[PDB]
Coordinates of C-alpha atoms and ligand atoms in Angstrom, one line a residue:
Chain A
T1 CA 29.7 51.5 66.1
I2 CA 28.1 54.6 64.6
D3 CA 25.5 56.1 67.0
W4 CA 23.0 57.1 64.4
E5 CA 21.2 59.3 66.9
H6 CA 24.3 61.3 67.9
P7 CA 23.8 65.1 67.2
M8 CA 27.1 65.3 65.2
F9 CA 26.0 62.3 63.1
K10 CA 22.8 64.2 62.4
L11 CA 24.8 67.3 61.5
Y12 CA 27.0 65.2 59.3
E13 CA 23.9 63.9 57.4
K14 CA 22.7 67.5 56.9
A15 CA 26.1 68.6 55.7
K16 CA 26.1 66.0 53.0
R17 CA 22.6 66.9 51.9
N18 CA 23.2 70.7 52.0
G19 CA 26.9 70.7 51.0
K20 CA 26.8 70.0 47.2
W21 CA 27.6 73.5 46.0
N22 CA 30.8 73.8 43.9
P23 CA 32.7 77.1 43.6
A24 CA 33.8 76.1 40.1
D25 CA 30.1 76.5 38.9
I26 CA 29.8 80.1 39.9
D27 CA 29.7 82.6 37.0
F28 CA 32.0 85.4 37.9
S29 CA 31.9 87.1 34.4
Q30 CA 29.6 89.9 35.6
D31 CA 31.8 90.4 38.7
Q32 CA 34.8 91.0 36.4
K33 CA 32.8 93.7 34.5
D34 CA 31.5 95.3 37.7
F35 CA 35.0 95.5 39.2
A36 CA 36.5 96.9 36.0
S37 CA 33.7 99.6 35.9
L38 CA 34.7 100.9 39.3
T39 CA 36.8 103.9 39.7
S40 CA 40.2 103.5 41.3
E41 CA 38.8 104.9 44.5
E42 CA 35.7 102.8 44.4
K43 CA 38.0 99.7 43.9
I44 CA 39.9 100.4 47.1
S45 CA 36.7 100.8 49.1
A46 CA 35.7 97.2 48.6
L47 CA 39.1 95.5 49.2
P48 CA 39.4 95.7 53.0
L49 CA 36.4 93.4 53.6
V50 CA 37.7 90.9 51.0
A51 CA 41.1 90.9 52.6
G52 CA 39.7 89.9 55.9
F53 CA 37.8 87.0 54.4
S54 CA 40.3 85.4 52.0
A55 CA 43.1 85.3 54.6
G56 CA 40.5 84.3 57.2
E57 CA 39.3 81.2 55.2
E58 CA 42.9 80.1 54.6
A59 CA 43.7 80.4 58.3
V60 CA 40.7 78.2 59.3
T61 CA 41.3 75.5 56.6
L62 CA 44.7 74.8 58.0
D63 CA 43.6 75.4 61.6
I64 CA 40.6 73.0 62.1
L65 CA 42.8 69.9 61.8
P66 CA 44.0 69.7 65.4
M67 CA 40.4 69.5 66.6
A68 CA 39.7 66.6 64.3
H69 CA 42.8 64.9 65.7
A70 CA 41.9 65.5 69.4
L71 CA 38.3 64.3 69.0
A72 CA 39.5 61.2 67.0
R73 CA 41.9 60.4 69.8
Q74 CA 39.1 60.6 72.3
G75 CA 37.1 58.1 70.2
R76 CA 34.4 60.6 69.2
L77 CA 33.8 59.0 65.8
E78 CA 30.6 60.8 64.9
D79 CA 32.3 64.2 65.6
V80 CA 35.1 63.2 63.2
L81 CA 32.7 62.2 60.5
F82 CA 31.1 65.6 60.8
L83 CA 34.5 67.4 60.9
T84 CA 35.4 65.9 57.5
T85 CA 32.5 67.9 56.0
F86 CA 33.7 71.0 58.0
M87 CA 37.2 70.8 56.6
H88 CA 36.0 70.3 53.0
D89 CA 33.6 73.3 53.4
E90 CA 36.6 75.5 54.4
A91 CA 38.5 74.2 51.3
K92 CA 35.7 75.4 49.0
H93 CA 35.6 78.7 50.9
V94 CA 39.3 79.3 50.2
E95 CA 38.6 78.2 46.6
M96 CA 35.6 80.5 46.1
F97 CA 37.5 83.7 47.2
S98 CA 40.6 82.8 45.2
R99 CA 38.4 82.3 42.1
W100 CA 36.7 85.7 42.6
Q101 CA 40.1 87.4 43.2
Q102 CA 41.4 85.9 39.9
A103 CA 38.2 86.8 38.0
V104 CA 38.4 90.5 38.9
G105 CA 42.1 90.8 38.6
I106 CA 43.4 91.2 42.2
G107 CA 45.1 87.8 42.4
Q108 CA 48.6 89.2 42.8
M109 CA 47.4 92.1 45.0
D110 CA 49.0 91.7 48.4
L111 CA 45.9 92.4 50.5
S112 CA 47.9 92.1 53.8
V113 CA 47.9 95.8 53.9
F114 CA 44.3 95.8 55.2
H115 CA 45.2 93.6 58.2
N116 CA 45.7 95.7 61.3
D117 CA 47.2 94.6 64.7
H118 CA 43.9 93.4 66.2
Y119 CA 43.2 91.3 63.1
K120 CA 46.7 89.7 63.2
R121 CA 46.2 89.0 66.9
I122 CA 43.1 87.0 66.1
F123 CA 44.0 85.1 62.9
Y124 CA 47.8 84.9 63.2
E125 CA 48.1 84.3 66.9
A126 CA 45.1 83.5 69.2
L127 CA 43.5 81.2 66.6
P128 CA 46.5 79.0 65.5
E129 CA 47.8 78.8 69.1
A130 CA 44.5 77.6 70.5
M131 CA 43.9 75.0 67.8
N132 CA 47.6 73.7 67.8
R133 CA 47.5 73.4 71.6
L134 CA 45.1 70.5 71.1
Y135 CA 47.8 68.3 69.7
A136 CA 49.4 68.1 73.2
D137 CA 46.6 69.3 75.5
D138 CA 43.0 68.1 74.9
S139 CA 41.8 69.0 78.3
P140 CA 38.2 70.4 78.6
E141 CA 39.7 73.9 79.1
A142 CA 41.8 73.6 75.9
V143 CA 38.8 72.3 73.8
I144 CA 36.5 75.1 75.1
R145 CA 39.0 77.7 74.2
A146 CA 39.6 76.3 70.7
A147 CA 35.8 76.2 70.0
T148 CA 35.4 79.7 71.5
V149 CA 38.1 81.3 69.4
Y150 CA 37.3 79.4 66.2
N151 CA 33.6 78.7 66.1
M152 CA 32.2 81.5 68.4
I153 CA 34.4 84.4 67.6
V154 CA 36.1 83.9 64.2
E155 CA 33.0 82.2 62.5
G156 CA 30.2 83.1 64.9
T157 CA 31.0 86.8 65.3
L158 CA 33.4 88.0 62.7
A159 CA 32.4 85.9 59.7
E160 CA 28.6 86.2 60.4
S161 CA 29.0 90.0 60.6
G162 CA 31.1 89.9 57.5
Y163 CA 28.4 88.2 55.5
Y164 CA 25.8 90.6 56.8
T165 CA 28.0 93.5 55.8
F166 CA 28.6 92.1 52.3
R167 CA 24.8 91.8 51.7
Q168 CA 24.0 95.3 53.2
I169 CA 26.4 96.9 50.8
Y170 CA 26.7 95.1 47.4
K171 CA 23.4 93.3 47.3
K172 CA 21.8 96.8 47.5
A173 CA 24.1 98.1 44.8
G174 CA 23.4 95.2 42.4
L175 CA 27.2 94.4 42.2
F176 CA 29.2 91.2 42.3
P177 CA 26.4 88.7 41.9
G178 CA 28.9 85.8 41.7
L179 CA 30.6 86.7 44.9
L180 CA 27.2 87.2 46.7
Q181 CA 26.1 83.7 45.4
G182 CA 29.3 82.4 46.9
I183 CA 28.8 84.2 50.2
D184 CA 25.3 82.8 50.5
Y185 CA 26.7 79.3 50.2
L186 CA 29.5 80.1 52.7
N187 CA 27.0 81.4 55.2
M188 CA 24.9 78.2 54.9
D189 CA 28.0 76.1 55.5
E190 CA 29.0 78.3 58.5
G191 CA 25.7 77.6 60.3
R192 CA 26.8 74.0 60.7
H193 CA 30.3 75.0 61.9
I194 CA 28.8 77.2 64.6
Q195 CA 26.5 74.5 65.6
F196 CA 29.5 72.2 66.1
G197 CA 31.1 74.8 68.4
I198 CA 27.9 75.2 70.4
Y199 CA 27.5 71.5 70.9
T200 CA 31.2 71.1 71.8
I201 CA 31.2 73.9 74.4
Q202 CA 27.8 72.9 75.8
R203 CA 28.7 69.2 76.4
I204 CA 31.8 70.3 78.3
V205 CA 29.9 72.8 80.3
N206 CA 27.3 70.1 81.0
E207 CA 30.0 68.2 82.9
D208 CA 31.0 71.1 85.1
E209 CA 29.1 74.4 85.1
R210 CA 32.4 76.1 86.1
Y211 CA 33.5 75.8 82.5
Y212 CA 30.7 78.2 81.7
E213 CA 32.7 81.0 83.4
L214 CA 35.7 80.0 81.4
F215 CA 33.7 80.3 78.2
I216 CA 32.5 83.8 79.0
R217 CA 36.0 84.8 80.1
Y218 CA 37.6 83.7 76.8
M219 CA 34.9 85.5 74.8
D220 CA 35.5 88.8 76.7
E221 CA 39.3 88.3 76.3
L222 CA 38.9 88.4 72.6
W223 CA 36.3 91.1 72.3
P224 CA 38.9 94.0 72.3
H225 CA 40.5 92.7 69.2
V226 CA 37.2 91.9 67.6
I227 CA 36.0 95.5 68.0
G228 CA 39.4 97.0 67.4
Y229 CA 39.5 95.4 64.0
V230 CA 35.9 96.4 63.4
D231 CA 36.8 100.0 64.3
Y232 CA 39.7 99.9 61.9
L233 CA 37.4 98.8 59.0
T234 CA 34.7 101.3 60.1
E235 CA 37.3 104.0 60.3
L236 CA 38.9 102.9 57.0
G237 CA 35.7 103.1 55.1
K238 CA 34.7 106.5 56.4
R239 CA 37.7 108.0 54.5
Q240 CA 37.1 106.1 51.2
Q241 CA 33.5 107.2 50.8
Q242 CA 33.3 107.2 47.0
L243 CA 31.6 103.8 46.5
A244 CA 28.8 104.6 49.0
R245 CA 28.1 107.9 47.2
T246 CA 28.3 106.5 43.7
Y247 CA 25.9 103.7 44.5
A248 CA 23.4 105.7 46.8
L249 CA 24.1 103.6 49.9
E250 CA 24.0 105.4 53.2
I251 CA 26.4 102.7 54.5
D252 CA 25.4 102.6 58.1
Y253 CA 28.6 101.7 60.0
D254 CA 26.9 102.3 63.3
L255 CA 24.4 99.6 62.7
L256 CA 27.0 97.1 61.4
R257 CA 29.0 97.8 64.6
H258 CA 25.9 96.9 66.6
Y259 CA 25.4 93.9 64.4
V260 CA 28.8 92.7 65.6
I261 CA 28.0 93.5 69.2
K262 CA 24.7 91.7 68.7
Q263 CA 26.4 88.6 67.2
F264 CA 28.9 88.5 70.2
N265 CA 26.2 88.5 72.8
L266 CA 24.0 86.1 70.9
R267 CA 26.8 83.6 70.9
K268 CA 27.1 83.8 74.7
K269 CA 23.4 83.2 75.0
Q270 CA 23.6 79.9 73.1
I271 CA 25.6 78.4 75.9
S272 CA 23.6 77.6 79.0
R273 CA 25.3 77.7 82.4
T274 CA 23.1 74.8 83.6
Chain B
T1 CA 47.6 81.6 45.7
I2 CA 45.9 78.5 44.3
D3 CA 47.9 77.1 41.5
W4 CA 45.0 76.1 39.3
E5 CA 47.2 73.9 37.1
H6 CA 48.6 71.9 40.1
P7 CA 47.9 68.1 39.7
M8 CA 46.3 67.9 43.2
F9 CA 44.1 70.9 42.4
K10 CA 42.9 69.0 39.3
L11 CA 42.4 65.9 41.4
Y12 CA 40.4 68.0 44.0
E13 CA 38.2 69.3 41.1
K14 CA 37.5 65.7 40.0
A15 CA 36.8 64.6 43.5
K16 CA 34.1 67.3 43.9
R17 CA 32.6 66.4 40.5
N18 CA 32.7 62.6 41.1
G19 CA 32.1 62.5 44.9
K20 CA 28.4 63.2 45.3
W21 CA 27.3 59.8 46.3
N22 CA 25.7 59.4 49.7
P23 CA 25.6 56.1 51.6
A24 CA 22.2 57.2 53.2
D25 CA 20.6 56.8 49.7
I26 CA 21.5 53.2 49.2
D27 CA 18.6 50.7 49.5
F28 CA 19.8 47.9 51.7
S29 CA 16.4 46.2 52.0
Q30 CA 17.2 43.4 49.6
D31 CA 20.5 42.9 51.3
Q32 CA 18.6 42.3 54.6
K33 CA 16.5 39.6 52.9
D34 CA 19.5 38.0 51.2
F35 CA 21.4 37.8 54.4
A36 CA 18.4 36.3 56.3
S37 CA 17.9 33.7 53.6
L38 CA 21.5 32.4 54.0
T39 CA 22.1 29.3 56.1
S40 CA 24.2 29.8 59.2
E41 CA 27.2 28.3 57.4
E42 CA 26.6 30.5 54.3
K43 CA 26.4 33.5 56.7
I44 CA 29.9 32.8 58.2
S45 CA 31.4 32.4 54.7
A46 CA 30.8 36.1 53.9
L47 CA 31.9 37.7 57.1
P48 CA 35.7 37.5 56.8
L49 CA 35.9 39.8 53.9
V50 CA 33.5 42.3 55.5
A51 CA 35.5 42.2 58.7
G52 CA 38.7 43.2 56.8
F53 CA 36.9 46.2 55.2
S54 CA 34.9 47.7 58.0
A55 CA 37.8 47.8 60.4
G56 CA 40.1 48.9 57.5
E57 CA 37.9 51.9 56.6
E58 CA 37.9 53.0 60.2
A59 CA 41.7 52.7 60.5
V60 CA 42.2 54.9 57.4
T61 CA 39.6 57.6 58.4
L62 CA 41.5 58.3 61.6
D63 CA 44.9 57.7 60.0
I64 CA 45.0 60.1 57.0
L65 CA 45.0 63.3 59.3
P66 CA 48.8 63.4 59.9
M67 CA 49.4 63.6 56.2
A68 CA 47.1 66.5 55.8
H69 CA 49.0 68.2 58.7
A70 CA 52.4 67.5 57.3
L71 CA 51.6 68.8 53.8
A72 CA 49.8 71.9 55.3
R73 CA 52.9 72.7 57.3
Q74 CA 54.9 72.4 54.1
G75 CA 52.6 75.0 52.5
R76 CA 51.2 72.5 49.9
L77 CA 47.8 74.2 49.8
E78 CA 46.5 72.3 46.7
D79 CA 47.4 68.9 48.3
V80 CA 45.5 70.0 51.5
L81 CA 42.4 71.0 49.4
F82 CA 42.4 67.6 47.8
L83 CA 43.0 65.8 51.1
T84 CA 39.8 67.3 52.4
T85 CA 38.0 65.3 49.8
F86 CA 40.0 62.1 50.7
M87 CA 39.1 62.4 54.3
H88 CA 35.4 62.9 53.6
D89 CA 35.4 59.9 51.2
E90 CA 36.8 57.7 54.0
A91 CA 34.0 59.0 56.3
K92 CA 31.4 57.8 53.8
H93 CA 33.2 54.5 53.5
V94 CA 33.0 53.9 57.3
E95 CA 29.4 55.0 57.1
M96 CA 28.5 52.7 54.2
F97 CA 29.8 49.5 55.9
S98 CA 28.2 50.4 59.2
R99 CA 24.8 50.9 57.4
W100 CA 25.1 47.5 55.7
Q101 CA 26.1 45.8 58.9
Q102 CA 23.1 47.3 60.7
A103 CA 20.7 46.5 57.8
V104 CA 21.6 42.8 57.8
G105 CA 21.9 42.4 61.6
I106 CA 25.5 42.0 62.4
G107 CA 26.1 45.4 64.0
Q108 CA 26.9 43.9 67.4
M109 CA 28.9 41.1 66.0
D110 CA 32.5 41.4 67.0
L111 CA 34.2 40.7 63.7
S112 CA 37.6 41.1 65.3
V113 CA 37.7 37.3 65.2
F114 CA 38.6 37.4 61.5
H115 CA 41.7 39.6 62.0
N116 CA 44.8 37.4 62.0
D117 CA 48.3 38.5 63.1
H118 CA 49.4 39.6 59.6
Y119 CA 46.3 41.8 59.4
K120 CA 46.8 43.4 62.7
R121 CA 50.4 44.1 61.8
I122 CA 49.3 46.1 58.9
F123 CA 46.2 48.0 60.2
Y124 CA 47.0 48.2 63.9
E125 CA 50.8 48.7 63.7
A126 CA 52.5 49.6 60.4
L127 CA 49.8 51.9 59.2
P128 CA 49.2 54.1 62.3
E129 CA 52.9 54.2 63.1
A130 CA 53.9 55.5 59.7
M131 CA 51.1 58.1 59.5
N132 CA 51.6 59.3 63.1
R133 CA 55.3 59.7 62.5
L134 CA 54.6 62.6 60.2
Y135 CA 53.6 64.7 63.1
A136 CA 57.2 64.9 64.2
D137 CA 59.1 63.8 61.1
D138 CA 58.0 65.0 57.7
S139 CA 61.3 64.0 55.9
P140 CA 61.0 62.6 52.4
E141 CA 61.7 59.2 53.8
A142 CA 58.8 59.5 56.3
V143 CA 56.4 60.8 53.6
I144 CA 57.3 58.0 51.2
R145 CA 56.8 55.4 53.8
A146 CA 53.4 56.8 54.8
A147 CA 52.2 56.9 51.2
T148 CA 53.5 53.4 50.6
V149 CA 51.8 51.8 53.4
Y150 CA 48.6 53.7 53.1
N151 CA 48.0 54.4 49.4
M152 CA 50.1 51.7 47.7
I153 CA 49.6 48.7 50.1
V154 CA 46.4 49.3 52.1
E155 CA 44.4 51.0 49.4
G156 CA 46.3 50.1 46.2
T157 CA 46.9 46.4 47.0
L158 CA 44.5 45.2 49.7
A159 CA 41.4 47.3 49.1
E160 CA 41.7 47.0 45.2
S161 CA 41.9 43.2 45.6
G162 CA 39.1 43.3 48.1
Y163 CA 36.7 45.0 45.7
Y164 CA 37.6 42.6 42.9
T165 CA 36.9 39.7 45.2
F166 CA 33.6 41.1 46.3
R167 CA 32.5 41.4 42.6
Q168 CA 33.8 38.0 41.6
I169 CA 31.7 36.4 44.3
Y170 CA 28.5 38.2 45.1
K171 CA 27.9 40.0 41.8
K172 CA 27.9 36.5 40.2
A173 CA 25.5 35.2 42.9
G174 CA 23.0 38.1 42.5
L175 CA 23.4 38.9 46.3
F176 CA 23.8 42.1 48.3
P177 CA 23.0 44.6 45.5
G178 CA 23.2 47.5 48.0
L179 CA 26.6 46.5 49.3
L180 CA 27.8 46.1 45.7
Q181 CA 26.5 49.6 44.8
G182 CA 28.4 50.8 47.8
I183 CA 31.6 49.0 46.8
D184 CA 31.4 50.5 43.3
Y185 CA 31.3 54.0 44.7
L186 CA 34.1 53.2 47.2
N187 CA 36.2 51.8 44.4
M188 CA 35.7 55.0 42.3
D189 CA 36.8 57.2 45.3
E190 CA 39.8 54.9 45.9
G191 CA 41.2 55.6 42.5
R192 CA 41.8 59.2 43.5
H193 CA 43.4 58.2 46.8
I194 CA 45.8 55.9 44.9
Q195 CA 46.6 58.7 42.5
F196 CA 47.5 61.0 45.4
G197 CA 49.9 58.3 46.7
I198 CA 51.6 58.0 43.3
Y199 CA 51.9 61.7 42.8
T200 CA 53.4 62.0 46.3
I201 CA 55.9 59.2 46.0
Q202 CA 56.9 60.3 42.4
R203 CA 57.6 63.9 43.3
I204 CA 59.9 62.8 46.1
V205 CA 61.6 60.3 43.9
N206 CA 62.0 63.0 41.2
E207 CA 64.3 64.8 43.6
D208 CA 66.5 61.9 44.4
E209 CA 66.3 58.7 42.5
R210 CA 67.7 56.9 45.5
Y211 CA 64.3 57.3 47.2
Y212 CA 63.1 54.9 44.5
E213 CA 65.0 52.1 46.2
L214 CA 63.5 53.1 49.5
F215 CA 60.0 52.8 48.0
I216 CA 60.6 49.3 46.6
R217 CA 62.1 48.2 49.9
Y218 CA 59.2 49.4 52.0
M219 CA 56.8 47.6 49.5
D220 CA 58.7 44.3 49.9
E221 CA 58.9 44.8 53.7
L222 CA 55.1 44.7 53.8
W223 CA 54.5 42.0 51.2
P224 CA 54.8 39.1 53.8
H225 CA 51.9 40.4 55.8
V226 CA 49.9 41.2 52.8
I227 CA 50.1 37.6 51.5
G228 CA 50.0 36.2 55.0
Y229 CA 46.6 37.8 55.5
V230 CA 45.6 36.7 52.0
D231 CA 46.6 33.1 52.7
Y232 CA 44.6 33.2 55.9
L233 CA 41.4 34.4 54.1
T234 CA 42.1 31.9 51.3
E235 CA 42.6 29.1 53.8
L236 CA 39.5 30.2 55.9
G237 CA 37.2 30.1 52.9
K238 CA 38.3 26.7 51.7
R239 CA 36.9 25.2 54.9
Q240 CA 33.6 27.1 54.8
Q241 CA 32.7 26.0 51.3
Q242 CA 28.9 26.0 51.6
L243 CA 28.2 29.5 50.0
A244 CA 30.2 28.6 46.9
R245 CA 28.3 25.4 46.5
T246 CA 24.9 26.8 47.1
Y247 CA 25.4 29.6 44.6
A248 CA 27.3 27.6 41.9
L249 CA 30.5 29.7 42.1
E250 CA 33.8 27.9 41.5
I251 CA 35.4 30.5 43.8
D252 CA 38.9 30.6 42.3
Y253 CA 41.2 31.5 45.3
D254 CA 44.2 30.9 43.1
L255 CA 43.2 33.6 40.7
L256 CA 42.4 36.1 43.4
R257 CA 45.8 35.4 45.0
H258 CA 47.4 36.3 41.7
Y259 CA 45.2 39.3 41.4
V260 CA 46.8 40.4 44.8
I261 CA 50.2 39.7 43.4
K262 CA 49.3 41.5 40.2
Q263 CA 48.1 44.6 42.2
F264 CA 51.3 44.7 44.2
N265 CA 53.6 44.6 41.1
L266 CA 51.4 47.0 39.2
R267 CA 51.8 49.6 42.0
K268 CA 55.6 49.3 41.9
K269 CA 55.4 50.0 38.1
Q270 CA 53.5 53.2 38.6
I271 CA 56.6 54.7 40.3
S272 CA 59.4 55.5 37.8
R273 CA 63.0 55.4 39.0
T274 CA 63.9 58.3 36.7
Ligands
PLM301 C1 31.5 97.3 60.1 C2 32.4 96.1 59.7 C3 32.0 94.8 60.5 C4 32.2 93.6 59.6 C5 33.3 92.6 60.2 C6 34.1 92.0 59.0 C7 34.5 90.5 59.2 C8 35.5 90.1 58.1 C9 36.5 89.0 58.6 C10 36.4 87.7 57.9 C11 36.7 86.4 58.7 C12 36.3 85.2 58.0 C13 36.8 83.9 58.6 C14 35.8 82.8 58.4 C15 36.2 81.4 58.8 C16 35.3 80.2 58.3 O1 34.9 80.2 57.2 O2 35.2 79.2 59.1
PLM302 C1 41.7 35.9 48.1 C2 41.4 37.1 49.1 C3 42.1 38.4 48.6 C4 41.3 39.6 48.9 C5 42.0 40.6 49.9 C6 41.0 41.2 50.9 C7 41.2 42.6 51.3 C8 40.3 43.1 52.4 C9 40.9 44.2 53.3 C10 40.2 45.5 53.3 C11 41.1 46.7 53.5 C12 40.3 48.0 53.2 C13 41.0 49.3 53.6 C14 40.6 50.4 52.7 C15 41.2 51.7 53.1 C16 40.5 53.0 52.2 O1 39.3 52.9 51.9 O2 41.3 53.9 52.0
MN303 MN1 34.7 79.3 56.0
MN304 MN1 33.6 78.0 59.1
MN305 MN1 44.1 99.2 69.3
MN306 MN1 38.1 53.8 51.9
MN307 MN1 41.0 55.2 50.5
MN308 MN1 52.4 33.8 59.3

């Protein structure tokens, strides 16, 4: 039947209760004015972080499907019910960033230019490969790896840090209130996504504590590309300093960096070896 | 980007606006009392139609995924955004029937007994085979067949007729107000599902009017099992006449039957050869 007490059924219920926001309701009119008011140099200072996210959301909307397939095939009905909310969330995320991009005029703008090699390695290689694998290989190893790259690294490390960074910068400056409303909603959805990942990894580790070592290993395997992208954005911003100056933000890249590091280690700690 | 004018983006927007209902909010307390008040013979008279639906909703929640995969792989982003709402709708449908079944006490009850051979041929063979095919064969032929069996026959013919039948019987009788609230919501969701099917078949026919003949052919191929199930339910009810008598319903199986026939032909007519 439905196991009403199943953790993923409970997460499904919360998703319905907490998932009513609609990107079509966000007022982006002030964002349009803010963006127009920026200098050409101030404009470029913002784009790298938006590039990472818009492309990232698109990647994950296509790439969660194989997990829903694999779990369906295993008969995990409550997981599948929850995953329908996960996939619809990601749809709204793609929608929200595309609306912002249109409202402020950079819809055309090929933002690919802000994706370095480490980024592409995560979003264009490790992520799609690990998810697609599940179509032919739904072994515990395969499922742990998919949840690690997608939920623990892409969402749980990069996206979390991305949200924090957005707040740290533009919330201070009083800029882009529509986008920040969007990001708050995104960040609320993402908490459920991460919880799914934790639950999935933990139940597999609960069967064989040796999958714990596999989890840690896959996390450390990805870390170089995580930090390598983070260094490239850090670096990139330190050149284009004009938005920080104009808006009186000592943009502390060294504390962001450690927020990333903090997120990575925190995700490890949410998986228990025993 | 997102093509804001795309028909499936517009259907996605409507789904969000019109898709807020939550099965967890439905009051089933009166349904519990109604069901308990029924005689043992009256109880059995209702179950066949509920059997068809609960199993049917479960089938379609698992079975829409390959279509979302195939269209994603073709780069039809707006279709995929809409399909996230379609899949979440089906989740709530499975949820709604399981809640009703629990509330009135038939959760255990193996309702498989009311699935005859024609039913199994649709839901356990033709439907999963046609959807799963899309994982390895996303040809126009394959996509038309998937949309025909799923959207035009299962939803557009059987489910539509099932809703009508539910209303005709229990709405008259003043019974099962919770279930009927649920069914109204379901039926509103299903209109978008059918519209997706029409759009999908029509855009493929628009490229080669010879796919029109393929559409009609696949519809007629399934008709025998549609009517054969409908005859078995018709037949089945005519024996167990006690609920009709008790509640003063001349249950007109001959008009239902023609409602089914009417639905089938109506679906053909929504696809234009030209
Ligand atoms: C000092 C800079 C550190 C900040 C790191 C920036 C992270 C931006 C990358 C965006 C990835 C978004 C993917 C989210 C996927 C989802 O929504 O499930
Ligand atoms: C005289 C009897 C005719 C009535 C026909 C009864 C139809 C019951 C079958 C239920 C199928 C439900 C599947 C719906 C799938 C979806 O929700 O997309
Ligand atoms: Mn997201
Ligand atoms: Mn996410
Ligand atoms: Mn490097
Ligand atoms: Mn349904
Ligand atoms: Mn449907
Ligand atoms: Mn027969």
